[PDB]
Every structure is written in C-alpha cells, then in structure tokens.
Design a protein around this motif. Structure first.
Motif, mmCIF file in Angstrom:
data_model
loop_
_atom_site.group_PDB
_atom_site.id
_atom_site.type_symbol
_atom_site.label_atom_id
_atom_site.label_comp_id
_atom_site.label_asym_id
_atom_site.label_seq_id
_atom_site.Cartn_x
_atom_site.Cartn_y
_atom_site.Cartn_z
ATOM 1 N N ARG A 58 0.824 -1.202 0.000
ATOM 2 C CA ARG A 58 0.000 0.000 0.000
ATOM 3 C C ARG A 58 0.860 1.255 0.000
ATOM 4 N NH1 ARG A 58 -1.695 4.336 3.430
ATOM 5 N NH2 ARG A 58 -3.960 4.448 3.730
ATOM 6 N N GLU A 59 1.947 1.253 0.776
ATOM 7 C CA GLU A 59 2.830 2.414 0.797
ATOM 8 C C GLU A 59 3.496 2.622 -0.556
ATOM 9 O OE1 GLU A 59 5.393 2.022 4.288
ATOM 10 O OE2 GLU A 59 3.565 2.370 5.449
ATOM 11 N N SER A 62 0.930 4.243 -2.717
ATOM 12 C CA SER A 62 0.738 5.628 -2.304
ATOM 13 C C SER A 62 1.875 6.514 -2.797
ATOM 14 C CB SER A 62 0.618 5.705 -0.783
ATOM 15 O OG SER A 62 0.783 7.035 -0.325
ATOM 16 N N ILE A 63 3.115 6.033 -2.688
ATOM 17 C CA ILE A 63 4.254 6.811 -3.162
ATOM 18 C C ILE A 63 4.170 7.011 -4.667
ATOM 19 C CG2 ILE A 63 6.732 6.667 -3.590
ATOM 20 C CD1 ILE A 63 6.980 5.483 -0.735
ATOM 21 N N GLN A 66 1.640 9.625 -6.257
ATOM 22 C CA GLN A 66 1.964 11.039 -6.136
ATOM 23 C C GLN A 66 2.790 11.553 -7.307
ATOM 24 O OE1 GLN A 66 3.129 10.408 -1.580
ATOM 25 N NE2 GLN A 66 2.882 12.587 -2.054
ATOM 26 N N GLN A 68 5.983 10.729 -8.170
ATOM 27 C CA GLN A 68 7.280 11.067 -7.606
ATOM 28 C C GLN A 68 8.431 10.257 -8.187
ATOM 29 O OE1 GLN A 68 6.670 12.455 -2.997
ATOM 30 N NE2 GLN A 68 5.792 10.473 -3.574
ATOM 31 N N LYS A 93 12.367 14.372 -5.742
ATOM 32 C CA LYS A 93 12.195 14.866 -4.379
ATOM 33 C C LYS A 93 13.416 14.555 -3.523
ATOM 34 C CE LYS A 93 7.797 15.461 -3.130
ATOM 35 N NZ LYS A 93 6.803 16.055 -2.196
ATOM 36 N N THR A 94 13.957 13.347 -3.647
ATOM 37 C CA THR A 94 15.139 12.941 -2.900
ATOM 38 C C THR A 94 16.437 13.224 -3.646
ATOM 39 O OG1 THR A 94 14.838 10.695 -3.763
ATOM 40 C CG2 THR A 94 13.935 11.179 -1.581
ATOM 41 N N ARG B 14 11.321 11.540 2.654
ATOM 42 C CA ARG B 14 10.694 12.744 2.124
ATOM 43 C C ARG B 14 9.479 12.422 1.266
ATOM 44 N NH1 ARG B 14 15.940 15.497 -0.276
ATOM 45 N NH2 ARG B 14 16.701 13.430 0.343
ATOM 46 N N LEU B 15 9.469 11.259 0.610
ATOM 47 C CA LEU B 15 8.331 10.898 -0.227
ATOM 48 C C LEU B 15 7.054 10.797 0.594
ATOM 49 C CD1 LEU B 15 10.024 8.199 -2.484
ATOM 50 C CD2 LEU B 15 10.006 10.687 -2.709
ATOM 51 N N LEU B 16 7.123 10.147 1.752
ATOM 52 C CA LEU B 16 5.979 10.010 2.640
ATOM 53 C C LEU B 16 5.971 11.045 3.755
ATOM 54 C CD1 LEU B 16 5.699 6.125 2.912
ATOM 55 C CD2 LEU B 16 4.169 7.685 1.706
ATOM 56 N N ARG B 18 7.922 11.738 6.526
ATOM 57 C CA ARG B 18 7.986 11.139 7.852
ATOM 58 C C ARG B 18 9.419 10.702 8.122
ATOM 59 N NH1 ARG B 18 4.929 5.381 6.435
ATOM 60 N NH2 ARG B 18 6.810 4.327 5.667
ATOM 61 N N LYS B 83 -3.211 11.073 6.079
ATOM 62 C CA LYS B 83 -3.252 10.811 4.648
ATOM 63 C C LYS B 83 -2.485 9.561 4.240
ATOM 64 C CE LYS B 83 -1.686 14.232 2.527
ATOM 65 N NZ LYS B 83 -1.265 15.408 1.717
ATOM 66 N N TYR B 84 -1.489 9.135 5.026
ATOM 67 C CA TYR B 84 -0.649 8.004 4.653
ATOM 68 C C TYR B 84 -0.746 6.804 5.585
ATOM 69 C CZ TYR B 84 1.580 11.526 1.707
ATOM 70 O OH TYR B 84 1.822 12.519 0.787
ATOM 71 N N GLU B 85 -1.121 6.989 6.845
ATOM 72 C CA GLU B 85 -1.127 5.876 7.779
ATOM 73 C C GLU B 85 -2.331 4.969 7.549
ATOM 74 O OE1 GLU B 85 0.650 4.693 10.734
ATOM 75 O OE2 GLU B 85 2.269 5.607 9.569
ATOM 76 N N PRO B 86 -2.232 3.699 7.940
ATOM 77 C CA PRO B 86 -3.406 2.823 7.892
ATOM 78 C C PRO B 86 -4.464 3.266 8.889
ATOM 79 C CG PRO B 86 -1.369 1.555 8.106
ATOM 80 C CD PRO B 86 -1.031 2.977 8.388
ATOM 81 N N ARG B 89 -3.983 1.996 12.576
ATOM 82 C CA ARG B 89 -2.964 2.717 13.332
ATOM 83 C C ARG B 89 -3.476 4.078 13.789
ATOM 84 N NH1 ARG B 89 1.733 0.085 10.692
ATOM 85 N NH2 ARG B 89 2.281 1.817 9.302
#
Ligand SMILES: [K+]
Ligand SMILES: [K+]
Ligand SMILES: [K+]
Ligand SMILES: [K+]
Ligand SMILES: [K+]
Ligand SMILES: [K+]
Ligand SMILES: [K+]
Ligand SMILES: [K+]
Ligand SMILES: [K+]
Ligand SMILES: [K+]
Ligand SMILES: [K+]
Ligand SMILES: [K+]
Ligand SMILES: [Mg+2]
Ligand SMILES: [Mg+2]
Ligand SMILES: [Mg+2]
Ligand SMILES: [Mg+2]
Ligand SMILES: [Mg+2]
Ligand SMILES: [Mg+2]
Ligand SMILES: [Mg+2]
Ligand SMILES: [Mg+2]
Ligand SMILES: [Mg+2]
Ligand SMILES: [Mg+2]
Ligand SMILES: [Mg+2]
Ligand SMILES: [Mg+2]
Ligand SMILES: [Mg+2]
Ligand SMILES: [Mg+2]
Ligand SMILES: [Mg+2]
Ligand SMILES: [Mg+2]
Ligand SMILES: [Mg+2]
Ligand SMILES: [Mg+2]
Ligand SMILES: [Mg+2]
Ligand SMILES: [Mg+2]
Ligand SMILES: [Mg+2]
Ligand SMILES: [Mg+2]
Lengths: 259, 127, 183
Positions: A58-59, A62-63, A66, A68, A93-94, B14-16, B18, B83-86, B89
RNA sequence: CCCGUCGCUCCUACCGAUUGAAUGAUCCGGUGAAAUGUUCGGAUCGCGCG
RNA sequence: UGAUUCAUGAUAACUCGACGGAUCGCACGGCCGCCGGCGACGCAUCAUUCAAAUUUCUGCCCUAUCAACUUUCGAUGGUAGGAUAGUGGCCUACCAUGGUGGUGACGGGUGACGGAGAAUUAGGGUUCGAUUCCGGAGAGGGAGCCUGAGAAACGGCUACCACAUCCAAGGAAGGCAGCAGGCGCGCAAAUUACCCAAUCCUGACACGGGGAGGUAGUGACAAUAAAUAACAAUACCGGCUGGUAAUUGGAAUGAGUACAAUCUAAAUCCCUUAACGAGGAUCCAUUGGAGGGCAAGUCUGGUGCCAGCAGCC
RNA sequence: UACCUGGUUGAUCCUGCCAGUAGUCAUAUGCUUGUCUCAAAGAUUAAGCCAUGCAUGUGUAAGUAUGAACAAAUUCAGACUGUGAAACUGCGAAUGGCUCAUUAAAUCAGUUAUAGUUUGUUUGAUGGUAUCUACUACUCGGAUAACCGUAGUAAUUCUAGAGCU
C-alpha cells in the motif's frame, strides 16, 4: 489455462529478486513493458525491498500515485512496471538518480549516477528494416523504435540515446576489442573485452570475453551488451567493475575486514 | 530504574513526509514501557510539536527481559499521518473511530440487494 | 497453498541399530551420568552432530589438497571448530577433526561449563540453575542446558541480574519466610 | 521310521444347465433432440425502399 | 537472413470497408475575432511485452495364455480445392498402394495424470511420487454454442441422459473435484468462526472487492527445545571422600493463576511482569518386557497340556 | 554412510528360507500425555450425493444526474459545474481455488521450430485525398434506462403495456 495468467507464485519469481520464501504466497507479477518479465525489476521491489522507502504494498502504491518516480525521464505510476537493464530511475524529491546494472553475482543493483549521467542511456539494437512508405527504422531490446536511423547502425550494435530529446547521439558497432557486460546466463554481470566471435550457420553465435584480470569466459551473442568503444565503458560501472571474485578470495577479504 | 530509548535504522522519508526508525527500549527495572510513554519520550527527544504524529508498533520484549524493540514513525504533521497511515494505526492513536461492522452481514445484504432493481434496492438488502 | 507448508524441518538423532548391546549401554549410561543428561536422546543427538561433522571432514580429506572446494570447506569447518572451542590453534588440520569425540562436544555444554567454573556444586545443580533462569551468557539470560558456548562467550558467563544469586529481589520462598517471621 | 484307500470336522479354490446377469469400451445397421449454415416465409417496425 | 519472387517501393484495378475523434477535466494566456498549455478516454498500423496454438529429436511400468495390424466409412503419399488464426487427410474429389511390426507393432492391464522431487544410502541400486512449484485435464455423463482479445467457460447458455428441489398442479428452478458444513463410504481425515492488517490480484479505481490469502478454533500426522527436583545437617554403609533414608533444615523455580503492559485488523497465544502458586514437593510418568535371539529373577502365591503365553525356537 | 543373530541334527559343515534387529515428510489403531517452537490434515473406499451461508464485482478532476435526495448559497439571477443514491455506458468475471476421473509416444521432461499463425493490454514510433454539382460543422438524428404509473402470476434479478429525458 484458458487465457493469460495474472498471478505469480513467490517460488516462481526470478531468483535475482531475492524474495523471502515465507514472505507470502505471491510475488509482484511484472506488467507488460519494455523489458521481459524474467529480466526486469518491478518498481515495487525497488521502492519497498531495495530502497525501503515503502514498508508495504500500500505504501508503494501511495508513493507512486503522487507522481514522484520517473523511469527514463517519464513518470510511471504502475507498481509492477518492468524496469530493466540500463534504465534510469530518478526521484526528484530525494535528488536520487539510479541506473539499473547487473552486479558480479548477476543481480540488479541500483547504481547511483550523477545528474549529467542520468540524461542518457544505452540500448542494444535488435534489427533494422523498412517500415511503411519505405521508411527505415530500428528497434532495441527495450521495446523502443527509432525511425531514420544512421545507415551505419546495424543489429547487435549499441546506441547512446538522449532521454531528453529521444535521439541517438552516438553508437558502438559490435566488434572484437570492445568492453561488454553479460546480461544473461551464469556469467551475467561480468565485464570484459571481446576476444573473438564464433559464427555457426543456423545456430547461435559464441562470444569469447576476457576479464580485466585475464579470466576468460564465453557466452551467446544475445547475452552480450557493448558498453563502450575500446576498453573504456561509456557509463559508470557498479562496485567491483564487473570482476567476479572466487569464493576463496571473497572469504579471505571478509576475514581481513573482520579484523 | 531509568528507561533508555535508542534508534538504530534512521531514515528521513521525504516521499511520505515522515521519519522511520527502529526503537530500542532498555527497561531493566520494569516489565515494559507502554506505547504512550514511548511516544512522549520520542516527542521530547525529537522536539515534536504534536505528539499525535508519532506512531509506534510491532513491539517484542526480549526473552531475558529488561529490553524491547519496535518500529516508530514520526510524521511532519498530523495531516500527513492521516493521509498516509493505515486506518487501524490512526484508531490506535485516537485520530479515528472504529466503526462496528460484520463482513458476513455485509455480504448477505449485498446478495439480497442483488435481486432488487431500482431505488427500492436500497431497502431490499435489509430484509 | 498454505505458505507455512514451505518451512522445512529435520531430525536430530537416530536410534541405535542394535537396541541391547550391553557394552554400548554401559558406556552410554556412564556418559549420561557423568554429564547429567536427562535421557539417551541427548547423547544420541550429540553423536549425530559429531558423525555429521566427521563425515564432512572425511569427505573433504578425500579431495585433492589443491582442490578449491576442499580449501574453502576445510577452512570453514576448521573455523567453526575453533569458534566453539572444539579445536585448538595448534590443531589446524582437518585430520584433527577426525580425532573428535562426543566428550569434546559435551564439554562445551552450558551445563558442563557452569559446573566447571564453580557456579554450581554439581552437574545437576548446574542443570537446575540454568533451567531456572539463574544464568546468563552475555547480557542474555539462557535457560537451555544444551546451549553450546563459544570460546569468546565462555568468559562472560555470570548469574542473571534479576535473580537472587546475581542481584536482589530474593525468591518467593525467602520473601514468604521473611513475611512470616515479621510477626 | 513310514505309504495309501476308507471314516469325521473345517478351509480354499476348480468344473457346471441356467440359450446366466451387470457395467465399461469398440463394431454393423437404424432412429435421432438441440444448435449452426442454407431455402422459402413475412407477424411487425421506420423512411417504393430498409 | 544460413536460406524466402522476404521487408519495402511502383503501376492497373477491386471492396456495397464497424478505420481516418460530432468525446471529457483542469487552468487561463498572446495578436487583432484569430491563435494557445497540461492531461483523460478512444480508432487504425508496425515493433515490443504479456502468451497461446501447432511443432523437431530422444526418453515411460507389467503382459506373447496378444504376431500380425491399418486400409468399405483416410489407412500411407500425390494433385486441386474447402475450412482454419494459420501448417497438415483437418475435410472433399481424383489418383497411387502405400504405412507399422521379435530393434515387440497391434491388443490388453495398471488400485497409471507427467515432472521438479521423497525414503534408503560404500558403489551400483530398490521403492514411492493424490497433495501447496511447473505442465495437462475435468467441473454429475456426453454433445453444441453465444459473448469476448482470450472459453468449446460450466459460481455462462442450449439439448439429451442420470439424479434431484418447489408447485396453488397450470409451471418454475438445478450442479460444492471452491470455503465451511451434512449424508454415505469406509481403517482412514478439523470450525457451517474473524479479517482484508500482510502477500498479491482485479475494476472506471491511491479509496471498492477478494472463503485467493491471512488470523484464530480442532489437531500426540511429522519435527524442535525441555519440567517432574537441587543443596546442606543427622543416621547408616564403602573406600577426607562417595551411595541410601515418606528424618531434619531452610533456599530455587515453573505448570497453574492474574493486575498490567505488550501482542493483534480486533482478539488470542508467545515474550515481559505486580500479588499468589511445592514436601509423600498427591504438582503422585508411562509404554513394553525379564528362557535365547535380546537388557533384565534358577524370588513368592495360584493354575496344572487347563486357562493362557509365545513374531521364531 | 561396505556389520548381522535364533531356527532343520545325537553332534557337524552346507543350501535355503522363516523369525529377529533398524528405517519411512507412512497410514491406521491402542495406552499415556505437564511446558515452548514448528506443522500435515475426506487423496486412498464414492470424479458418490448435497440442506444452509459465503466464495466477483467495479467510480476518477477527467463518459451519462433535474431522485419529486441531502447541504451551502442566491433577493435576484440563474443551463450545469458541492456531495451524490439509482440507472445507462465501459471493463472484469478465460485469473485464482479445487481434484486426479480419463489418458501409455499420449500427457510430460530436456531440447527445437513458426520463413506455418493469433495475441485485449503495456512500452516506442506512425496517422495528409471522405463533401467534390445536396451542401449543420459555432456541433447532425431517432430512441431507451433510472424515474413515473396501469398491471399479470402461487412464484423467480419471472414478465406486458403507458408517459418522459
Ligand atoms: K514420459
Ligand atoms: K490449416
Ligand atoms: K493432399
Ligand atoms: K496426464
Ligand atoms: K473483452
Ligand atoms: K464444501
Ligand atoms: K489485502
Ligand atoms: K527374549
Ligand atoms: K500434505
Ligand atoms: K455494469
Ligand atoms: K471479459
Ligand atoms: K518438451
Ligand atoms: Mg486456472
Ligand atoms: Mg512482397
Ligand atoms: Mg492445401
Ligand atoms: Mg503428481
Ligand atoms: Mg487414484
Ligand atoms: Mg487435497
Ligand atoms: Mg498445479
Ligand atoms: Mg475446461
Ligand atoms: Mg459430484
Ligand atoms: Mg452436465
Ligand atoms: Mg462445459
Ligand atoms: Mg461450483
Ligand atoms: Mg470457474
Ligand atoms: Mg487420522
Ligand atoms: Mg512428535
Ligand atoms: Mg507428574
Ligand atoms: Mg540377557
Ligand atoms: Mg549393501
Ligand atoms: Mg535338537
Ligand atoms: Mg486414474
Ligand atoms: Mg514425441
Ligand atoms: Mg499487441
């Protein structure tokens, strides 16, 4: 089956991905794209398994949603997008630019590259032929098609492609005395200079390559990628410079590092 | 009897938006450290304006005792976390409310509504 | 497919080919009593490990001295034996691996070491101390008597910091007796 | 020490009228649902047509 | 290109061509109404990727109480067509008599899906492979088919056959070799639970869904570690040294129990841990044996070729 | 990881088997069973038959909103530009899961070929003549869903008319 398979069992995933046996029942099935499924590295593996930016599927999604991550200067939002040999992966971004290259052990390595080096990539030509209206064109092994190519360019040559303009800026003819990297087989990821070529009618051609340390190995024509003219590659190689080290010397180096 | 917190695999994502790291907790005197105390200690250590942006999970106490390990996330702000966390959580931190539902009941209601067409389909699934 | 199915497991011992050899029984009982083992299965497990190591060494010794596989695996095996105290630096040849006995492996047990350094009055006392969480190797409490102690970790053996013999907080029996005596 | 008929109990298969029976697969010939293609047909629908 | 009257170009024509955008979101600008950006969706061609179909060579268990088999009605090959996405007796017409076989054809059996592999290991070998990965096949038995890029699909349709539910008797609906669960069968195999949190798949889609998959329940299939006691005093014994004692003495601890935290999608378990938790430490270890093979009594009572034991003697 | 022991005789040496010993990610059953970590599990006989529930649906700023749906605004004007149920349209359901009945050069393994074909999708490139005397291209035409209202049947995502868009 009655049609295309959409799933990939984890045990059936290519070994160079290095997926845990007990991680799950499935592995990310590569999507259709410039590179073959067995010879690619999906963006999900790069972002989650390798760079560890994402801790989950999922992460990763999500990334990517965007906008990115860019592949060959184009934003890709497909998690299973097949990114393969010589591709450039950039994350503005990085401020990270990576080139996908095979390490001495035959596994894709994210080789950090400079901004200038990130503006071009190498491609291997499959064939040159005439399209409609008699327009000549060539196609590379990464799914690209280029019209009006240089007449000197022919099959198995390497072309330097500028991603910003999508134009050929230089090319290397496949010939003896050129530094190449093996992109398949047991010798995948090794770098050396061609010594001689054996051609057999109606059969695969054999290429003999000599390592910088004098080690000799042979492979098929389709597994050889030319990296430059002469002995200097046109791109920066990963750590090890494509030199395969025997297990004994690797153990010696590890023990020396331990102390 | 003083607890110590250490972070090992630090990365600025930086992408997320956090920070992700592993948490090492040394509690020789007490059985464990609750997630609230760890959150407050992390906020003090990292100077977090809003403690609600700190998430800690997947904790395991070592066999001998007096030590534990886990994973922590510190978001730049609460909105990024939301916006990003489950969802679960966020619920654990009180930023979200758990909604009571039964998957089997949802499936049965969907199947019942399958047989009714139009606006009446809305109350068809009740039955 | 159940992903758990892909986890693999193996046996650790074999039963004797002849159940009732009197001399074998006497020798095994002598070893078990000397080292305070709970049953013959522990001795057979140690014998299984020793047999595996000796078979590997014997296989390697058959290869040519300059064989890269022999060099690599022999160095690995010798390093493994040196790490656990089975072989001394002078014993730097695969030949000395074949001269290893079950007693050598038994002497590396945490129970035997705890008895030897003097933390226990007897081997059985060492066993009960280990299984009762009174012993730690480094900063880690260990309650497995079969624990094989490496040479580096041998000097770190000490009483558990949360135990009566290593720190404070006496046992429940002592606390109960103290409470009873308070009246 | 030993062989066989005869006599008793139990067990296992074998032959056997019954033009024996069942199931499965092929062989000869016959009937043959449904669907598809074709011929005719034209309830009906839109602007002499479709 | 190893190899193509191949890629591709040009001409004559042909086709009653599903082609060649009457679509949508963001913004808001330059010239004098005209121009103008970033995208979404969609049509066609080539290449590529994801694949399939067909295909070359070599390889399979037992059986001769199976030695000839195939060829009207395709068997082997040729010519011309039809059909196919395409090669091909795949099918049609005509023609020829071919094709396989003790180097085992053909026929039969298999409690026969094949492989990766499993058990055992001097070496050689023997036995197994339903089952999580790969390939094939099937969806009660056959057959036919629509949609579609892709199916001869069965949680699609049509017909017959066998079973079989409802009915107001006029009709109407069927497919668990999916997850649970029930009957039956047997020597022989678990809950009609929770969840999409992980792995991944899928849709218009960052969001929905997923009995795939995971969690938990039953679980001595199989595998791993590992309690049921340790130490002193006294008394006995044997040489300060050892062994025994439901004699004495205090120490230790987890099985259990339970705040709490932790775990978890939420729970539970594990790990950690306040307060409890051991003297016949009743917190009581069992399964098989004691003539030999084969470790262990010519002990005591009963039975008396009985009852019984005994893998063999 | 190259091993044997009891049993034919008064005794002997043999052949030879029976019995024993050990193993199975091998089934079943018997007795027993305190703790931790793993983990197979209606295959074998019946691819035998199945009550009940679930297992395939799907929405982005970006195809189609006038719910007689909710909310905020508008004092005057407004085609609509906030959420949007329902419905049409598109896509998916040919993957996954289950089982081993049929099948003995057949499936299948390794190794080949397509110069003998099809291939939604992804990725890279590529789109020049239509009306030619009708003559909208500053943009063509006719319906239907949802909705609404007359219903039939014991009955089913069984079904007929009518009014819109
Ligand atoms: K075969
Ligand atoms: K054909
Ligand atoms: K022919
Ligand atoms: K088969
Ligand atoms: K389709
Ligand atoms: K079932
Ligand atoms: K999920
Ligand atoms: K015996
Ligand atoms: K199994
Ligand atoms: K639909
Ligand atoms: K479809
Ligand atoms: K093959
Ligand atoms: Mg399938
Ligand atoms: Mg041509
Ligand atoms: Mg032909
Ligand atoms: Mg099999
Ligand atoms: Mg079977
Ligand atoms: Mg099964
Ligand atoms: Mg399979
Ligand atoms: Mg099928
Ligand atoms: Mg059935
Ligand atoms: Mg049927
Ligand atoms: Mg069917
Ligand atoms: Mg079904
Ligand atoms: Mg299906
Ligand atoms: Mg059972
Ligand atoms: Mg067990
Ligand atoms: Mg007990
Ligand atoms: Mg004896
Ligand atoms: Mg042998
Ligand atoms: Mg005798
Ligand atoms: Mg069968
Ligand atoms: Mg063949
Ligand atoms: Mg394509």
């Amino acid at each position: 089956a009655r049609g295309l398979k959409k799933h990939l069992k984890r045990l059936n995933a290519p070994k160079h991905w290095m997926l845990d046996k007990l991680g799950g029942a499935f592995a990310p099935k590569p999507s259709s794209g410039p590179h073959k499924s067995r010879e690619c590295l999906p963006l999900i593996i790069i972002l989650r398994n390798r760079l560890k930016y994402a801790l989950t599927y999922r992460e990763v999604i999500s990334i990517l949603m965007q906008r990115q991550v860019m592949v060959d200067s184009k934003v890709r939002t497909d998690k299973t997008y097949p990114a393969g040999f010589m591709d450039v992966v950039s994350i503005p971004k990085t401020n990270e630019n990576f080139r996908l290259l095979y390490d001495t052990k035959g596994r894709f390595r994210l080789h950090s590259v400079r901004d200038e080096e990130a503006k071009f990539k190498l491609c291997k030509v499959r064939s040159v032929q005439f399209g409609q209206k008699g327009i000549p064109y060539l196609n590379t092994y990464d799914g690209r098609t280029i019209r009006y190519p240089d007449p000197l360019i022919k099959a198995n040559d390497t072309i330097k492609l500028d991603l910003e303009s999508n134009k050929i800026v230089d090319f290397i003819k496949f010939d003896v005395g050129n530094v190449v990297m093996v992109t398949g087989g047991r010798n995948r990821g090794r770098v050396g200079v061609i010594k001689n070529r054996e051609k057999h009618k109606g059969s695969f051609e054999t290429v003999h390559i000599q390592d910088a340390l004098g080690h000799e190995f042979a492979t098929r024509l389709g597994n050889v990628f030319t990296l430059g003219k002469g002995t200097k590659p046109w791109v920066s190689l990963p750590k090890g410079k494509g030199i395969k080290l025997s297990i004994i010397e690797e153990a010696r180096k590890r023990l020396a590092a331990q102390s | 009897k003083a607890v110590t917190i250490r972070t090992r695999k630090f990365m600025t994502n930086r992408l997320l938006a956090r920070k992700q790291f592993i948490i090492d907790v040394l509690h020789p005197g007490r059985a464990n450290v609750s997630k609230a105390e760890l959150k407050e200690k992390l906020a003090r250590m990292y100077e977090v304006k809003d403690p609600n942006a700190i998430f800690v999970f997947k904790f395991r106490t070592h066999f001998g005792g007096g030590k534990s390990t886990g994973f922590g996330l510190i978001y730049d702000s609460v909105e990024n976390a939301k916006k990003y966390e489950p969802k679960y959580r966020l619920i654990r931190n009180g930023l979200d409310t758990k909604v009571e539902k039964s998957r089997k009941q949802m499936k049965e209601r969907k199947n019942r509504a399958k047989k009714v067409r139009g606006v009446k389909k809305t109350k068809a699934g009740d039955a | 497919v159940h992903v758990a199915f892909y986890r693999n497991y193996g046996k650790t011992f074999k039963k004797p080919r002849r159940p009732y050899e009197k001399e074998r029984l006497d020798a095994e009982l002598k070893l078990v009593g000397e080292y305070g083992l709970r049953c013959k299965r522990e001795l057979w497990r140690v014998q299984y490990a020793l047999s595996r190591i000796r078979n590997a060494a014997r296989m390697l010794l058959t290869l040519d001295e300059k064989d890269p596989r022999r060099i690599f695996e022999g160095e690995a095996l010798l390093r493994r034996m040196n790490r656990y105290g089975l072989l001394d630096e002078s014993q730097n040849k695969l030949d000395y691996v074949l001269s290893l006995t079950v007693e050598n492996f038994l002497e590396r047990r945490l129970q035997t070491l705890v008895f030897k350094t003097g933390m226990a009055k007897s081997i059985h006392h060492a066993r009960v101390l280990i299984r009762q969480r009174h012993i730690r190797v480094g900063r880690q409490v260990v309650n497995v008597p079969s624990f094989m102690v490496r040479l580096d970790s041998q000097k770190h053996i000490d009483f558990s910091l949360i135990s009566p013999f290593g720190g404070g907080r006496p046992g429940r029996v002592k606390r109960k007796n103290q409470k009873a005596a308070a009246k």
